[PDB]
Amino acid sequence: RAKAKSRSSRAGLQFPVGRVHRLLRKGNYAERVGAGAPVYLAAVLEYLTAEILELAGNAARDNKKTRIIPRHLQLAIRNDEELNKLLGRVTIAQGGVLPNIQAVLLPK
Amino acid sequence: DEVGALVFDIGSYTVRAGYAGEDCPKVDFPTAIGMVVEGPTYYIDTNALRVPRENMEAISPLKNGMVEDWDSFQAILDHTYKMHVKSEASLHPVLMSEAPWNTRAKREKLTELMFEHYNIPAFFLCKTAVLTAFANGRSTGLILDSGATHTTAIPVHDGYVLQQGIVKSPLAGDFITMQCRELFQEMNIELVPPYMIASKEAVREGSPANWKRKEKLPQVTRSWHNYMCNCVIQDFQASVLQVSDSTYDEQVAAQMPTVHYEFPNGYNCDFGAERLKIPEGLFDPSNVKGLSGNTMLGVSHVVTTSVGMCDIDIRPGLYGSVIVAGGNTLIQSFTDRLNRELSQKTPPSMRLKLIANNTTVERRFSSWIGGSILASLGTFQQMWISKQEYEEGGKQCVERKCP
Amino acid sequence: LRDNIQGITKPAIRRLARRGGVKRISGLIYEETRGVLKVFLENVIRDAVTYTEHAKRKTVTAMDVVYALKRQGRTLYGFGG
Amino acid sequence: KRPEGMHREVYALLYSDKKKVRPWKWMPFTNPARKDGAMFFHWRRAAEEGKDYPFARFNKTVQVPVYSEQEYQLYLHDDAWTKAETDHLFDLSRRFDLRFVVIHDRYDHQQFKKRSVEDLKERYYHICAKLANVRAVPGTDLKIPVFDAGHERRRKEQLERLYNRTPEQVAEEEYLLQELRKIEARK
Amino acid sequence: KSHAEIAEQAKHEAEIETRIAELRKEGFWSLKRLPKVPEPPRPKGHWDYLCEEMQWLSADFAQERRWKRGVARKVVRMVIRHHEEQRQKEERARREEQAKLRR
Amino acid sequence: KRSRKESYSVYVYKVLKQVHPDTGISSKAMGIMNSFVNDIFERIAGEASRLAHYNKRSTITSREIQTAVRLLLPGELAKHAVSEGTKAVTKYTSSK
Ligand SMILES: Nc1ncnc2c1ncn2[C@@H]1O[C@H](COP(=O)(O)OP(=O)(O)OP(=O)(O)O)[C@@H](O)[C@H]1O
């Protein structure tokens, strides 16, 4: 047959469209899944991941570190306005918190 | 990078000529051709060959991958040029295959015959093992070629053959044809070639053949008759024979489904263990009657001896790049039995792996595909022995220009 | 086991409060924090053991804890493979 | 009325959420990498007619020194090696890209006594080293790392003794398993 | 002692003796694996160029073969669907007749 | 006898390296990242399933996924993700 092309490469994404479609079709989500749903889902997930990774890398460079650690993830999430709202009810292990000291508890 | 050339693979069974860069040869025609003094004439494509014609004469142009009759070889070349290639030789280089055991004398004689008779602009003579390796995609490995005349294991290292590591055995298509002949004579099967049959009728299994002989058959020599009979026997081989998975056991062979086959004369019958007992000699000649000799080496024995006669440092590469090729390798379960025996006999310290080039085109035309992809390379454009090279260095320049 | 809630000492609770931003801590805050942590662990481990028993397993895996935290609303990354 | 006119999925997603001259020619050409001036042919374009052969860069033959008659007679003299043999060895080295496993097979045993691979390699390296050790001015190659042949002979012998051992492999593996067993027991 | 552990110790000593014998025979580990291998590669080798392009074009033909037999395959294929579409074209004309019937 | 478990680490690292050539990521950060991917996948797929069930449809489509993304993602992230998904669904159906 012709050289097989993957759906992820065809669309222009990196996340596994095949595995996303497998999960969607065998899961509780629906009886059968259309070809466009998993592509869209994988694209959205890839975009969220790219955004959070950019923020984490920025935090890492700020802290003078080459490896993104959960600190750089927690700081990124709690510094970003929209990602914070997205992951408000999500805790990250070994991520820590922000140095948000109330102005009322400072030396006077 | 690509240049219009001519790739030739002249084996003892078939000759494959074509252009460099194609996945398949332009024309493949048997090598065991006849001869008729019309002077001596020769044929190609099997349609001018398998014809009942007055006074069919014997001839053997090339045996064991080496030229046996230079006149018949030149005639075959001329016919391949003017009949099927249909192009002047001076317009296309020539990359021709040769057996590793070819002699320097035959090499130089072929070079001078190609440079002074056809006036080809460039010439190259490559070994069948190197060509098979280049086709299969490996520069180091053991090429196992089981042709019509011999079964040979040839170790190639970095694109060069190690003569001291080569091993050969006479158990080949000729041995298989002899065994089929003996089986037919034992089962009382009259081997009738097609050219002797005018008409036939359908008869029950195992019953005598009801066929009529032609009334105006021409004069044909015993050699041509044996050639037709060997063609029929090779058809029977390709349609019936099968290699045993494990060492031949009569009890296990008597529990295998039979294979039905009908000869040209209409005699049709089923074969049971006799079709699996013949191909066993290729791997174990000790159980073959009429072969009272233990010095003969089976396929696995040849492989192991060829690997052992090489430097221990390269044996891992040979075991890991063992390449299987040849016409006899198309027999069912042949490569399975080979892999089993090699895994049993090879030290586990060295990884064993056989290339899966099991297709008919990949197997029988491996030596030609190799030359095609080797001549279709820009790098290879510097290894061409030019007409000027021949004129300046003479016939002996071949040994230095193409090992 | 017994009285292992006392394995959360005043220095540990004071470090947990420092990480939350508290500057000055009272005396009964430590008891209140122990009681709250115990109530939270009770529900989390009850959900985990409910996910475990149902699986006929004898070991509480990390996925059980993850699912319990998701049920309780505390989605936890870093332990989901 | 619905405009649409495009693909169903893309359409729903978008709206539901609002002078010829350049003939190829069979041109001849010469490869500058060759010294015989052999002329070949190729289907080149109409732009790079007469341009240098692009693959000509692939002509970096292996580096092998070339001793002279006087140099050989003076320094490379060896009682167990003659010119007839050393010149042939160097020719094979130059021809087959310095691979001794193949040089040994291409060796001319009909005119010279049989040789192994290690002796040939040692001879070649000793020649290369002695040719340059005559003076310190040569900068191309002065201290050629002559490989070890003594230890190589052992590495060959006590490994060929292991290669063709049929049941000894299983025996050694079993005793090694037992060895680890009781060693862990005595740890 | 355990009237058995000493027997196990004697068995281990016999094993040690047998291993000493096997070592005197052929050894257990060929130490000094390629210690002195100073073979210096050429500036570029120049033979990897051939091997590199060799791998480049070798897989190409193998790929082009599977692609070609796949391409010609799907060609003769839509050929069958086309002929089927001609019989299916007559069936669609029959369906149009039935649609006129329905109208 | 292998018990191989899948993950998104092979593509999370590809995107990472394409959006930041010089920056790497640790194993714990990769695990948290895969957890985030799984969580948002579950969220969006469940929202699309809910939309389908509300519209009385047994199949989820790109339109259901688009409305689910619009509902889930907040403000100026929703628009970005939706434009990305739309552009991908149009570059995928164009046979490129
Ligand atoms: N389809 C087939 N099945 C089994 N055997 C076959 C088949 N086709 C050919 N053979 C066997 O292949 C042999 C010849 O094949 P091959 O072309 O490899 O020989 P060759 O290499 O050209 O010449 P030589 O064997 O002299 O080198 C014949 O002996 C024939 O019996």
Distant-in-sequence, close-in-space partners of B20: CB < 8 Å, separation ≥ 6 = B2, B3, B4, B5, B6, B7, B95, B371, B372, B375, B376
Label residue E27 left, alpha or beta by phi (over 0 means left) and psi (-120 to 50 means alpha).
left
Kindly state the tokens that stand for D124.
Answer: 């070649």
Report the 10 Å Cβ neighbour count for D137. Answer: 7
3-state secondary structure of D96: coil
> Rounded CA gap, B28 and B46, in Å?
10
> Rounded CA gap, B326 and B14, in Å?
11
Q: B103, B91, B37: which is closest to B65 by C-alpha?
A: B103
Distances in Å between the Cα of B28 and the Cα atoms of B87, B228, C71 are 17, 18, 73
> Rounded CA gap, B166 and B143, in Å?
10
Q: Which residue has the tokens 């003094």?
A: B37
What is the CB-side half-sphere exposure of residue A46 using CA atoms within 13 A? 26
> Rounded CA gap, A69 and A88, in Å?
19
> Is A107 contained in some domain?
no
Kindly tell me the burial class for residue B327, based on how many C-beta atoms sit within 10 Å of its own C-beta (0-12, 13-18, 19 or more). Answer: buried
> Rounded CA gap, B56 and B224, in Å?
6
> Rounded CA gap, F76 and B182, in Å?
87
Chain B, 208 to 237: residues with Cβ < 8 Å from chain E are none
Kindly tell me the burial class for residue D92, based on how many C-beta atoms sit within 10 Å of its own C-beta (0-12, 13-18, 19 or more). Answer: buried
- In order, the DSSP letters of F37-89 are HHHHHHHHHHHHHHHHHHTT-SEE-HHHHHHHHHHHS-HHHHHHHHHHHHHHH
Is the distance from CB of A24 to CB of F51 less than 8 angstroms?
Answer: no
Ligand 1: distance of its center to the CA of B329 in Å? 8
CB burial readout C4-13, b (16+ within 10 A) else e: eeeeeeeeeb
> Is A108 contained in some domain?
no
How many residue contacts between A and E have a Cβ separation below 8 Å? Answer: 10
How many residue contacts between D and F have a Cβ separation below 8 Å? Answer: 28
Domains of chain F: 3-96 (1.10.20.10)
Dihedral angle sign, alpha carbons of residues B341, B342, B347, B353: negative
Tell me which chain B residues have a C-beta less than 8 angstroms from the C-beta of D110. Answer: none
DSSP letter at D81? B
The set of chains that have 3 or more CB pairs under 8 A with C is A, F
Angle at which helices D8-15 and F62-72 pack, to 10 degrees? 30
Kindly state the tokens that stand for C28.
Answer: 């009964």
> Rounded CA gap, D102 and D117, in Å?
9
The overall longest dimension of chain C from CA atoms, in Å, is: 47
Kindly state the tokens that stand for D121.
Answer: 């390699």
> Rounded CA gap, F72 and F87, in Å?
19
> Rounded CA gap, B258 and B270, in Å?
6
> Rounded CA gap, B194 and E72, in Å?
35
> Rounded CA gap, D46 and D37, in Å?
23
- Contacts of the segment D139-146: beta carbons below 8 A, 24+ positions apart: D140/D65, D141/D63, D141/D65, D145/E38, D145/E39, D145/E40, D146/D122
Tell me which chain C residues have a C-beta less than 8 angstroms from the C-beta of F26. Answer: none
After which residues does a break in chain D occur, C–N more than 2.5 Å?
18
> Rounded CA gap, B363 and A20, in Å?
42
Kindly tell me the burial class for residue D18, based on how many C-beta atoms sit within 10 Å of its own C-beta (0-12, 13-18, 19 or more). Answer: exposed
> Rounded CA gap, A19 and F7, in Å?
10
Measured CA angle at A30 (ends A27, A33), to 5 deg: 95
The pairing of beta strand D39-44 with beta strand D25-30: antiparallel
The pairing of beta strand F59-60 with beta strand A32-33: parallel
> Rounded CA gap, F26 and F32, in Å?
10
> Rounded CA gap, D49 and D46, in Å?
6
In one-letter notation, the amino acid at residue B52 is P
> Rounded CA gap, E25 and D28, in Å?
68
Name the closest-CA residue to atom 6, ligand 1: B327
Closest CA–CA distance from residue A4 to any residue of chain E (Å): 10
Distant-in-sequence, close-in-space partners of D54: CB < 8 Å, separation ≥ 6 = B378
What is the CB-side half-sphere exposure of residue B174 using CA atoms within 13 A? 12
Distant-in-sequence, close-in-space partners of B307: CB < 8 Å, separation ≥ 6 = B142, B153, B155, B165, B315, B318, B319
Is the distance from CB of D58 to CB of B379 less than 8 angstroms?
Answer: yes
Is the distance from CB of B236 to CB of B268 less than 8 angstroms?
Answer: no
Report the 10 Å Cβ neighbour count for F34. Answer: 21
Kindly state the tokens that stand for E7.
Answer: 């027997």
By the CB < 8 Å criterion, does A36 face chain D?
Answer: yes
Distant-in-sequence, close-in-space partners of F16: CB < 8 Å, separation ≥ 6 = A53, F23, F24, F25
Residue in A closest to C72 by C-alpha:
A89
Angle at which helices A36-63 and F62-72 pack, to 10 degrees? 30
Determine the length of chain E. 103
Tell me which chain F residues have a C-beta less than 8 angstroms from the C-beta of A54. Answer: 19-20
Q: Are the beta carbons of F39 and C75 separated by less than 8 Å?
A: yes
- Determined by cryo-EM
Adjacent-strand bridge partners of B10: B15
Kindly tell me the burial class for residue B191, based on how many C-beta atoms sit within 10 Å of its own C-beta (0-12, 13-18, 19 or more). Answer: buried
Kindly state the tokens that stand for B189.
Answer: 């099967």
Report the 10 Å Cβ neighbour count for B331. Answer: 20
> Is A83 contained in some domain?
yes
Q: Are the beta carbons of E22 and D155 separated by less than 8 Å?
A: no
Distant-in-sequence, close-in-space partners of C18: CB < 8 Å, separation ≥ 6 = none
Distances in Å between the Cα of D118 and the Cα atoms of A77, B108, C72, D152 are 65, 32, 74, 7
Kindly state the tokens that stand for B1.
Answer: 């990078």
Q: What is the CATH number of the domain that holds A91?
A: 1.10.20.10
The H or E element containing residue C66 is: helix C62-72
The pairing of beta strand A90-92 with beta strand B66-67: unpaired
The H or E element containing residue D88 is: helix D83-95
DSSP letter at A80? S
The set of chains that have 3 or more CB pairs under 8 A with F is A, C, D
Is the distance from CB of B20 to CB of B371 less than 8 angstroms?
Answer: yes
Dihedral angle sign, alpha carbons of residues D33, D36, D37, D39: negative
By the CB < 8 Å criterion, does F34 face chain C?
Answer: yes
Adjacent-strand bridge partners of A90: C75
Q: What are phi and psi of B20, to 5 degrees?
A: -75, 130
Report the 10 Å Cβ neighbour count for B151. Answer: 25
Distant-in-sequence, close-in-space partners of B204: CB < 8 Å, separation ≥ 6 = none
Distances in Å between the Cα of B193 and the Cα atoms of B52, B178, B224, B231, D134 are 11, 16, 11, 8, 78
> Rounded CA gap, B134 and B357, in Å?
13
Q: Which residue has the tokens 């060997």?
A: B230
CB burial readout D104-129, b (16+ within 10 A) else e: bbbbeeeeeeeebbbbbbbbbbbbbe
Q: What is the 3-class SS of E4-61, one letter each residue?
A: CHHHHHHHHHHHHHHHHHHHHHHCCCCCCCCCCCCCCCCCCCCHHHHHHHHHHHHHHH
> Rounded CA gap, F12 and B45, in Å?
59
> Rounded CA gap, B99 and B132, in Å?
12
DSSP letter at E101? H
> Rounded CA gap, B294 and B342, in Å?
20
Q: To one decimal place, what's the resolution in Å?
A: 3.2
Is the distance from CB of B9 to CB of B16 less than 8 angstroms?
Answer: yes
After which residues does a break in chain B occur, C–N more than 2.5 Å?
38
Distant-in-sequence, close-in-space partners of B311: CB < 8 Å, separation ≥ 6 = D101, D104, D117
- Contacts of the segment E95-98: beta carbons below 8 A, 24+ positions apart: none
> Rounded CA gap, D108 and D85, in Å?
9
Kindly state the tokens that stand for B274.
Answer: 């006799």
In one-letter notation, the amino acid at residue B65 is G
Determine the length of chain B. 403
Q: What is the 3-class SS of chain B, one letter each residue?
A: CCCCCEEEEECCCEEEEECCCCCCCCEEEECCCCEEECCEECCCCCCCCCCCCCCEECCCCEECCEECCHHHHHHHHHHHHHHHHCCCHHHCCEEEEECCCCCHHHHHHHHHHHHHCCCCCEEEEEEHHHHHHHHHCCCCEEEEEECCCCEEEEEEECCEECHHHCEEECCCHHHHHHHHHHHHHHHCCCCCCHHHEEEECCCCCCCCCCEEECCCCCCECHHHHHHHHHHHHHHHHHHHCECCCCCCCHHHHCCCCCEEEECCCCCEEEECCHHHHCHHHHCCHHHCCCCCCCCCCCHHHHHHHHHHCCCCCCHHHHHHCEEEECCHHHCECHHHHHHHHHHHHCCCCCCCCECCCCCHHHHHCHHHHHHHHHHCCCHHHHCCEEHHHHHHHCCCHHHHHCC
Kindly state the tokens that stand for D35.
Answer: 């010294």
Range of the domain at A66: 4-102
> Rounded CA gap, B398 and B29, in Å?
28
**Domain spanning C1-81: CATH superfamily:** Histone, subunit A (1.10.20.10)
Q: What is the 3-class SS of C24-39, one letter each residue?
A: CCCCCHHHHHHHHHHH
DSSP letter at D73? I
Report the 10 Å Cβ neighbour count for B373. Answer: 25
The H or E element containing residue F94 is: none
Is the distance from CB of A44 to CB of F44 less than 8 angstroms?
Answer: yes
The H or E element containing residue D32 is: none
Q: Are the beta carbons of A2 and E67 separated by less than 8 Å?
A: yes
> Rounded CA gap, F65 and F82, in Å?
10
> Rounded CA gap, E53 and B378, in Å?
9
The H or E element containing residue C55 is: none
Kindly state the tokens that stand for B190.
Answer: 């009259």
Kindly state the tokens that stand for D98.
Answer: 């310095």
Q: B118, B53, B51, B52: which is closest to B79 by C-alpha?
A: B118
Is the distance from CB of B31 to CB of B12 less than 8 angstroms?
Answer: yes
Q: Are the beta carbons of D178 and E15 separated by less than 8 Å?
A: yes
> Rounded CA gap, A79 and A60, in Å?
13
> Rounded CA gap, B368 and B106, in Å?
20
Distances in Å between the Cα of B299 and the Cα atoms of B185, B321, B324 are 27, 16, 11
> Rounded CA gap, F70 and A44, in Å?
11
Number of domains present in the structure of chain A: 1
Q: A21, A45, A43: which is closest to A34 by C-alpha?
A: A21
Is the distance from CB of B155 to CB of B161 less than 8 angstroms?
Answer: yes
Q: Are the beta carbons of A2 and E63 separated by less than 8 Å?
A: no
CA dihedral F63, F68, F69, F70 (to 10 degrees): 90
Kindly state the tokens that stand for F42.
Answer: 């579950």
Q: B7, B303, B358: which is closest to B141 by C-alpha?
A: B303
E strands along A1-108, which residues?
32-33, 67-68, 90-92
Ligand 1: distance of its center to the CA of D126 in Å? 49
> Rounded CA gap, B218 and F22, in Å?
84
Name the closest-CA residue to atom 19, ligand 1: B147
The pairing of beta strand B151-157 with beta strand B167-169: antiparallel
